[PDB]
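Hi,

I'm pasting everything inline rather than attaching a file, because the server keeps stripping attachments. The sequence lines come first, and each chain or strand is labelled.
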Amino acid sequence: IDAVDASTVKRVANKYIYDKDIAISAIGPIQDLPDYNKFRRRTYWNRY
Amino acid sequence: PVKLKAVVYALSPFQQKIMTGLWKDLPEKIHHKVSENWISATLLVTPVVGTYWYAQYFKEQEKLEHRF
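And the predicted assembly:
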């Protein structure tokens, strides 16, 4: 655990989160839940 | 807001082929277009082509009858 520093967190997040496919499961009044493309776009920041 | 009940399953755009569908079922696509649309096509082409050909025939007959 102590070996996990900020740079480690960023490396792991870039491996697992950045510009990655996602799985979504939703139930109920979910019409305002954004579609798959919006969720997929929000996995990266184009300002960087 | 309309009250809706449905289940929607979707696949990610990066897990499917994007262009091959253009050329799939191509005979069905052509057959549907022809069979559903041939009346509309006739109703569009026939008056224009007929009027044009009749005008050309009228002009040819008028030109010939004014000669000597």
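Residues 44 and 59 of chain B are 24 Å apart (CA to CA).

If the labels don't parse on your end, tell me and I'll reformat.
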